[PDB]
Amino acid sequence: MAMKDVVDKCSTKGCAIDIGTVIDNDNCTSKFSRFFATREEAESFMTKLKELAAAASSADEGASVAYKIKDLEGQVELDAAFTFSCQAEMIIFELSLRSLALEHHHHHH
């Protein structure tokens, strides 16, 4: 009772680095917040964010970055706003963050 079994379309190369995760829809500028024990811990983590930013966004010096450092009592707030040009580069950055840094609690978005 069945006759139709034919399909052919595997033309995809995967030029864009995607883990296969969902897309966060609202902005193109992502804001990454983490709480550390020292402002040192905050600025130390910024280093690897820059490393990751260079991978996600090429550009001359990468995407735009406006970071927050709030000196609290016993901890600090590290919140870096990365202004990307595309949403693709923004979401994959979040993906990379989840892969490398991992500890952003878990399911933020």
Side-chain angles (χ1 to χ4, degrees), residues 91-106:
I91 50 170
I92 62 92
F93 183 70
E94 293 287 291
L95 307 185
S96 305
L97 294 177
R98 288 171 55 169
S99 185
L100 199 62
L102 225 173
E103 190 170 281
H104 200 179
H105 190 229
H106 182 246

Side-chain angles (χ1 to χ4, degrees), residues 14-32:
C15 310
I17 50 176
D18 177 18
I19 317 186
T21 322
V22 296
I23 296 78
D24 179 63
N25 169 86
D26 197 70
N27 299 273
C28 54
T29 299
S30 193
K31 326 78 162 66
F32 178 79

Side-chain angles (χ1 to χ4, degrees), residues 49-95:
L49 267 295
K50 298 315 198 63
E51 304 180 289
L52 286 175
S57 53
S58 312
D60 288 84
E61 299 171 81
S64 305
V65 54
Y67 63 85
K68 297 162 190 167
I69 301 180
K70 184 172 178 59
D71 318 271
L72 294 174
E73 190 187 308
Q75 59 169 88
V76 293
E77 282 178 343
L78 192 283
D79 182 63
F82 288 91
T83 301
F84 293 93
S85 309
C86 320
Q87 177 161 92
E89 46 188 60
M90 186 279 293
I91 50 170
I92 62 92
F93 183 70
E94 293 287 291
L95 307 185

